Design an enzyme around this catalytic site. Structure first.
Site, PDB file in Angstrom:
ATOM      1  N   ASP B  29     -60.998  -2.942 -56.350  1.00 36.13           N
ATOM      2  CA  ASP B  29     -61.751  -2.302 -55.278  1.00 36.13           C
ATOM      3  C   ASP B  29     -60.900  -1.157 -54.687  1.00 36.13           C
ATOM      4  O   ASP B  29     -59.708  -1.336 -54.424  1.00 36.13           O
ATOM      5  CB  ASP B  29     -62.136  -3.348 -54.208  1.00 36.13           C
ATOM      6  CG  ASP B  29     -63.188  -2.894 -53.213  1.00 36.13           C
ATOM      7  OD1 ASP B  29     -62.917  -1.941 -52.448  1.00 36.13           O
ATOM      8  OD2 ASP B  29     -64.272  -3.528 -53.159  1.00 36.13           O
ATOM      9  N   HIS B  98     -72.597  -6.838 -56.681  1.00 34.04           N
ATOM     10  CA  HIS B  98     -71.186  -6.960 -56.971  1.00 34.04           C
ATOM     11  C   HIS B  98     -70.598  -8.182 -56.334  1.00 34.04           C
ATOM     12  O   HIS B  98     -70.878  -8.493 -55.174  1.00 34.04           O
ATOM     13  CB  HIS B  98     -70.385  -5.712 -56.542  1.00 34.04           C
ATOM     14  CG  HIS B  98     -70.632  -5.274 -55.130  1.00 34.04           C
ATOM     15  ND1 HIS B  98     -71.832  -4.679 -54.752  1.00 34.04           N
ATOM     16  CD2 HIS B  98     -69.808  -5.317 -54.057  1.00 34.04           C
ATOM     17  CE1 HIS B  98     -71.701  -4.386 -53.468  1.00 34.04           C
ATOM     18  NE2 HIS B  98     -70.499  -4.750 -53.002  1.00 34.04           N
ATOM     19  N   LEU B  99     -69.779  -8.871 -57.103  1.00 31.47           N
ATOM     20  CA  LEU B  99     -69.077 -10.032 -56.614  1.00 31.47           C
ATOM     21  C   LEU B  99     -67.675  -9.568 -56.208  1.00 31.47           C
ATOM     22  O   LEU B  99     -66.942  -9.062 -57.045  1.00 31.47           O
ATOM     23  CB  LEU B  99     -68.976 -11.059 -57.755  1.00 31.47           C
ATOM     24  CG  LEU B  99     -68.133 -12.296 -57.451  1.00 31.47           C
ATOM     25  CD1 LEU B  99     -68.892 -13.278 -56.565  1.00 31.47           C
ATOM     26  CD2 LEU B  99     -67.691 -12.966 -58.732  1.00 31.47           C
TER      27      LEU B  99
END
Ligand SMILES: CNc1nc(N)nc2c1ncn2[C@@H]1O[C@H](COP(=O)(O)O)[C@@H](O)[C@@]1(C)F
Ligand code: NA
Lengths: 115, 112
Positions: B29, B98-99
């Site tokens: 991320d 999204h996880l």
């Protein structure tokens, strides 16, 4: 024992009362006893899996089914503005019950970071 | 209805890719909330979890198996938190499912 002997296994076998939202052959959804949001429930598999780190490759469908059931229950509970789904793993994750469970929190603005 | 995650899947913009297969991609991320913070996303464009169908169960569960395997490879032996945000109350930022997987520090309760 089918479902195991954690508090979640007892709830699965109706040995301890819980506020059930939905139940099928693979999972159970019920309200959390210490809600961290106006709506806060858990979706658990009926098959005992201690933690997500030890789930097998063939548990994919079951883990995805927890999320599909979580989003269906959220819509049925009127969470039209959104919600957060959470899976805690181990000590750093804050996991306190070693039977896989998906948290679904809503009814308020969830903040970032998520803990 | 393209998204920034669609550009990452298509390799049109850089990303620190951790893992990729024929149906998902895991990457770090860009705005991390923990020492280790990565995402696992389906290549199929599902805008949000509220619109995922019953046929997507296997794909959604695949995100979590890939997520837990990536966490083990990244050395998250003390645990981690997996999060899926839905809508404005959930704090969903990109409209591509999204996880999030976060570790490297103690995660607190409530989870936001
Ligand atoms: C009476 N039971 C509880 N009461 C209060 N006050 N907090 C509780 C209770 N059970 C659990 N928690 C909290 O839930 C978090 C997530 O746990 P898990 O669902 O992922 O296993 C734990 O870190 C906790 C101890 F802070
Ligand atoms: Na996209």
């Amino acid at each position: 024992r089918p479902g195991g002997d954690t508090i979640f296994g007892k709830i699965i076998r109706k040995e301890i009362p819980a506020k059930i939202i939905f139940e099928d052959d693979r999972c159970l959804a019920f309200h959390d006893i210490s809600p961290q949001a106006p709506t806060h429930f858990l979706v658990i598999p009926k098959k005992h899996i201690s933690q997500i780190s030890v789930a097998e490759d063939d548990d994919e469908s079951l883990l995805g089914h927890l999320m599909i059931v979580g989003k269906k229950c959220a819509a049925d509970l009127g969470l039209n503005k959104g919600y957060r789904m959470v899976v805690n793993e181990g000590s750093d994750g804050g996991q306190s019950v070693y039977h896989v469970h998906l948290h679904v929190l809503g009814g308020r603005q969830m903040h970032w970071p998520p803990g």
